[PDB]
Every structure is written in structure tokens, then in C-alpha cells.
Structure 1
Amino acid sequence: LPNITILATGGTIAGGGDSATKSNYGVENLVNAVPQLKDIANVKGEQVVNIGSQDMNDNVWLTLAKKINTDCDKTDGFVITHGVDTMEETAYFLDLTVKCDKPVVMVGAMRPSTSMSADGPFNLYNAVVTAADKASANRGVLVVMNDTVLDGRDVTTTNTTDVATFKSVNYGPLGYIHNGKIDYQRTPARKHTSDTPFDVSKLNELPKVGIVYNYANASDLPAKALVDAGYDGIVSAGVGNGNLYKSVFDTLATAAKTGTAVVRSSRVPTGATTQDAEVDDAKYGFVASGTLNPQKARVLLQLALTQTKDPQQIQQIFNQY
């Protein structure tokens, strides 16, 4: 049986409340909770941090990537237990920075461990299956939830409470898990892991990138505040195909001319923010995010900014990764 390391970070997978009914709510304990894991793997757990993923942050990301990269040779695969709220952000960061070519699988739960029909046990089982499968390697960093293997780039949470929330809403899943076996029919084409130039091994921190939302009568104050604090990048959560309210547009145009990287994404939950629509990016020094949602576009923008501040180079990164 393969050796699989679980790196725990917290999340509802590790949460609990006073009741198995009511909605209000350690890695050794999790493992003992799923004894069946011994049928499939030799499991070792490490608790890396213990936070709700609503409090996920750059340092946790750097700590995870460096640890995976450092421990690659000591294990056959990793499982990361993580909250659902920002799982899609961490998974993409790891998909761009991990250089290990063993599976890295993220997993969480939508119901607390203490609740009736808790999804965490079987999710964890399925994540270990995935991390153990030789066919899971070279697919990038993965998320496994509700019997489905999802690529770290496209995966996002679609519903606030549904156990089936995680979907790759633009390009679909990679494989489905039945009876402990995966039929893989897809692999992401965008470059990942050892095919990216991002190397976080020596980094102590990440460039500052903020996100602003667009809607009717949007205030420019959020954007101005990021500009005044000297943010390296700003991502716009645009309306429709990446459009901005005028006041927001004017602040971001000015910023871009002072060297602030500006990426247009969309608050719309699927589809690409495209070039050659209503915004002349080349003219303003803006970058179109493609299918990257605003939180995901931030991940790439941060990493882009460790290599270049040039908008045209940043656009090329947004076309390749």
C-alpha cells in the first residue's frame, strides 16, 4: 500500500457543534474516524495549522507549498484537509507552485463531522484513493469532493450549503470515483506544477493584490484605498464580460499608468472575461483574466508579479497558466 501524508489545515471537515441536528458549529482524530483508510494506504498525518479557511492567507500558502516540495521524496502522495470557503484559491496556488510530481489532493466537508450523514469520512476516503492512484499523477493539484476529481484551476464552490457544491464549472471534472476506482477522461491543458516558472522556495511573502466588486452605482473608494496603500495589483470583479462601472474604471486606469497591475475578471460565475469586447485592454494597460474568477485571478496575478510588472507579459501568463 502507498504511503500517503495528510497535511491538515482545519475547515468544517475538522469542525463540530453541540448537536448532530443543529446547524451551528486534530488530524489523528480524523484518521481514527476513518479506519477504512488502512485498506488503501499507510497514512501519516501532520497538523500544519488549524484555521477556518475563511482566514486562509499568503503565509499558509507559502508554508504548504514549501513543505510539499521539501517532503516530496518522503511519501507517495499528499492529501490536504481544508475548509470549503477558500479551497478553490489554495488549490490553484498549489497547482501553480508545487513541483512535486506525486498527487496532491485537497479535501473538505460541507457538514460538520458531528452532524448526521456527515460527508467528511467518505470524502477523506475518496481523497486518499485519489492520492494513491498512480493515474492521478501529472494532472496538477486536485480537489476531491462528492465522488469527483476536479482540477485545481477550474474548480470552484457553487452553492453555500450543498454537499455537491464543488464543480469545474467551465471545463468539467477529470474523473469520477466509484467503488474506490477512478475513470479518468480529462487532464488540464493549462500549464501546472513543474511546468510553471513560479518558484516560491525562497519567498517570505507575496505581492499585494486586492479585489474590487462592480455593481450599479459602484463606489470608487475601495479601489482608491488599494491604490493609496500602494497595492502591486488589483483584480476587478466586473459585471457581465468583465466591465467596470465608470468611477471604478477611471481609478483603475489611473493606477495602471502609475504601474499598478490591473486584471479584469468577472463576478459572473462561469465563462471567460475575454479580450476584444468593450474594453481596450492594450490601451489601458489592463489584463483579461479568461476563465479565472476574481479570487483565482488574484492567485495568478500575485505569482505573475514575482516575475514581472509588465502588462503584456502578465497577459501572456494569463494565457498560459
Structure 2
Amino acid sequence: HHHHLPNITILATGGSIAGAVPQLKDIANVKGEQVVNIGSQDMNDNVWLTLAKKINTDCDKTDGFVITHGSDTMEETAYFLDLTVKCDKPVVMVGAMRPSTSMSADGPFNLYNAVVTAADKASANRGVLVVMNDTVLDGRDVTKTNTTDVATFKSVNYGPLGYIHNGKIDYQRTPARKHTSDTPFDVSKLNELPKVGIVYNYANASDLPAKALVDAGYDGIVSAGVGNGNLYKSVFDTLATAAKTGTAVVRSSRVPTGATTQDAEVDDAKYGFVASGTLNPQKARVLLQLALTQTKDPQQIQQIFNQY
């Protein structure tokens, strides 16, 4: 029985991350589309919606997706797609911490291993994935850990799903949080997403950013609080008042690992707030936006934040 290489679609959102990688046509039949071409620091709602509708639409036509993405916001898009993709085939985002034209450019081998991952039958049903520096990382926990390191992407709370050696993956973990077709989030018909902004906390923090998003009518605000999701008093006060009038308010934390818990120093039930768990501010944003498509009920949003 002859060998039959799987069909992998590469959806590009930005420039090239290798530049191509000839060794790919030994492990797969690759076709490419350019969906957008933006620096990922300009990543946005409309790109997310395109990617989710594109993956869900083209599911039938291929064996897996690799998405090439700037590293800056890959962790946000990864998680959005983790929640909105309904396609049962592997979806593997990949990027490069050194540019394709650089010495020891890292994109070529990351792309190789991204395709390996996307062709591996064992990668399906693990959620949307991020493959970087020989590692398969779940889209929920993966975050950018260092501003330059090639090893920067890590799942800082629950670890990676497997490591990649010589084109093979040893999977020892899968995320237990509900993803992809187990979520109720369906963007197939949405033209926009609810407006969710992020305010930082720190000593002497001004409440003017919070007030501005409130006055703008934002659907939700994520607080990147201090410690275990705590807020500077003025920020607290502004966000407490907004919640009494329907603004969703998720307490996250600027602290780079660890859950922002319930039943700690903030009485969320009293105040109408939601605890983000291990979702960092930009990740809590992704889930809050998608939550607000179902409900503005803070008890139900908290539930969503305990399931997804």
C-alpha cells in the first residue's frame, strides 16, 4: 500500500515566517491561502471572525489547518479559535521569534513541526493548538513568556501537551476545559463581537481608563488586577458602579501565572464581578466577549469562566 500524505491548509495572517521549507512535501501536501496580511499587534475581531468562519467552512476540504501568525497576539487568537472552531480536525497556529531572513531563523522548523502536529491523527480533539520550539501547547494556557526568546511560548499553569522529536509527538496531556465543538459559542453569523476592554492596576492607578470604557458603553471590562485579581480602590469603585448597571466585569490579574480565584479578597457575588481563573487579562477578554454573545448574567458568565 503506497504512502499517502495528508492535505494541510496553511492560513497566513501576516508575512512569511520562513523564506521555502522544501522538507514539508515529504510529510504533507500543502496548499496556502492568505487570509489577511497584518502585523499581529494589529490583530482584531474581524480577523478572528474570518478565521473561525473559514476553518468551519473549509473543514470538509482538508485534513488539518496550520495558521501562521505573528507571535504577539497568537495566544489570543489561539484561544478565540479554541472556543469557536467546530471542525474536528487539528488546527495548529505557529509563528517565529526570529525573522525568516535572520541567522538561525526559527520559523522553518517551527512550520515543519506545526505541519507534523497538524498531520498527526493523535492531535485531533485536543483543542486548537500552538506549536513552537518543538512543543505542542494548548491554546487556552499557552502564553508568550519572554519578549525575544525562541522558547518564549509556554503553558505556564498546566504545561504542554507533548514534545516533538524527529517528527513525532509524545502526547501525555490534553486540556480538560471545554473547547471547540463542546462550546456553545457560534460566530458563524456574527458581524461583530461585544466590546471588551482591559484596564491595568498598579499603585496610584487612575480610574480614567475604566471610566472611559464605561462611558463608551463597553459590554465588558477585564481588570488586570494586582495579586489575586485585586483592584486599586478608584478602579474598583468605577467598576462596581458600572456592574450595577449591566457592565460585565471580570477580575483577572497582571500576575503572569496563577488563577484569580473566587472566594478570596473580593466578594464577586456582592459586586457583580466574575473571577477569571487562570485566564490572563487578554485571555479573559476572549472568553468574556464570547460569553456576552450568550448572556449578560454575571452568575452565568462566572459559570462559563469555570467551564471554558
Q: Same fold (TM over 0.5)?
A: yes
Which of 7, 14, 34 is 2:11 aligned to? 7
What is the rounded CA distance, in whole Å, between the counterparts of 2:302 and 2:227 in structure 1?
20
What is the rounded CA distance, in whole Å, between the counterparts of 1:11 and 1:292 in structure 2?
29
SS of 1:124's equivalent in the other structure is helix
SS of 2:231's equivalent in the other structure is coil
What is the rounded CA distance, in whole Å, between the counterparts of 2:97 and 2:6 in structure 1?
28
Q: Deviations over 1:90-128 (max 9, x none)?
A: 000000000000000000000010000000000000000
Structure 2 match to 1:115: 102
Q: Is residue 19–residue 100 contact of structure 2 (8 Å, CA) maintained in 1?
A: no
- Unaligned 5+ segments in structure 1 are 14-30
TM superposition score normalised by structure 1: 0.94
Q: Is residue 223–residue 252 contact of structure 2 (8 Å, CA) maintained in 1?
A: yes
What is the rounded CA distance, in whole Å, between the counterparts of 1:65 and 1:290 in structure 2?
25
Deviation at residue 291 of structure 1 after TM alignment: 0.1
Deviation at residue 11 of structure 1 after TM alignment: 5.3
Structure 2 match to 1:204: 191
What is the rounded CA distance, in whole Å, between the counterparts of 1:46 and 1:134 in structure 2?
23
What is the rounded CA distance, in whole Å, between the counterparts of 2:185 and 2:165 in structure 1?
35
The runs of at least 4 aligned residues of structure 1 exceeding 4 Å deviation read: none
Q: How many pairs are equivalent?
A: 304
Q: Is residue 12–residue 110 contact of structure 1 (8 Å, CA) maintained in 2?
A: no
Q: Deviations over 1:150-198 (max 9, x none)?
A: 0000000000000000000000000000000000000000000000000
What is the rounded CA distance, in whole Å, between the counterparts of 1:270 and 1:278 in structure 2?
18
Deviation at residue 12 of structure 1 after TM alignment: 7.0
What is the rounded CA distance, in whole Å, between the counterparts of 1:32 and 1:297 in structure 2?
35
What is the rounded CA distance, in whole Å, between the counterparts of 1:98 and 1:183 in structure 2?
24
Q: Is residue 92–residue 296 contact of structure 1 (8 Å, CA) maintained in 2?
A: yes
- Unaligned 5+ segments in structure 2 are none
Structure 1 match to 2:264: 277
Are residues 267 and 12 of structure 1, via their aligned partners in 2, closer, same or farther at CA, if it must alter by over 3 Å?
farther
TM superposition score normalised by structure 2: 0.98
What is the rounded CA distance, in whole Å, between the counterparts of 1:124 and 1:178 in structure 2?
14
SS of 2:136's equivalent in the other structure is strand
What is the rounded CA distance, in whole Å, between the counterparts of 1:277 and 1:317 in structure 2?
19
Are residues 283 and 51 of structure 1, via their aligned partners in 2, closer, same or farther at CA, if it must alter by over 3 Å?
same
Structure 1 match to 2:125: 138
Deviation at residue 32 of structure 1 after TM alignment: 7.5
Q: Is residue 12–residue 83 contact of structure 1 (8 Å, CA) maintained in 2?
A: no
What is the rounded CA distance, in whole Å, between the counterparts of 2:120 and 2:19 in structure 1?
22
Q: Is residue 12–residue 109 contact of structure 1 (8 Å, CA) maintained in 2?
A: no
Kindly report the root-mean-square deviation, in angstroms, between the aligned alpha carbons of the 2 structures: 0.8
Q: Is residue 167–residue 173 contact of structure 1 (8 Å, CA) maintained in 2?
A: yes
